[PDB]
Amino acid sequence: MNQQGFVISNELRQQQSELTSTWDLMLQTRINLSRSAARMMMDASNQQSSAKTDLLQNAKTTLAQAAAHYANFKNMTPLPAMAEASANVDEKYQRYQAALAELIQFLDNGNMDAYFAQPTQGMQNALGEALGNYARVSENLYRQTF
């Protein structure tokens, strides 16, 4: 306030919002993937040999949304303290965006056998850490403005 500090401030909420809707969708997608893996049941009749009909629709769509939310935060500026914070969440986002995008080539193309090979879990816990680090440091810029 007294210029400076407001647009700087709204830009920090703007970033810690859609990093949050970047993440949330990446957790929704890892539900909606398993919703198919397990719904490839000893039923087989409801002839969707793997395929979309409802829950793979939802796990390519829910992901595409994550990937759009991230863009409005990474085409947005690292307020300089945010250098090794953003620069980590990108590397992270690029580990776990990919790990998901493979479970689709797996789950529309029947391939369970590879679907359970990769630590989808390790690639998420590690991003849960980076995410935390950007919050613990973003707050620390602001645990200076109050």
Q: What is the DSSP string of 58-117?
A: HHHHHHHHHHHHHHHHHTS---GGGHHHHHHHHHHHHHHHHHHHHHHHHHHTT-HHHHTS
Contacts of 67 (CB under 8 A, 6+ apart): 97
Quoted resolution (Å): 2.7
Cα angle 106-94-21, degrees, rounded to a multiple of 5? 95
Q: How was this structure determined?
A: X-ray
The residue segments making up the domain with residue 23 are 1-146
Q: Is the dihedral of CA 57, 62, 68, 71 positive or negative?
A: negative
d(CA 74, CA 72): 6
Among the listed residues 30, 91, 10, 123, the one whose alpha carbon sits nearest the alpha carbon of residue 83 = 91
Count of domains forming the chain: 1
- Provide the CATH number for the domain around residue 111: 1.20.120.30
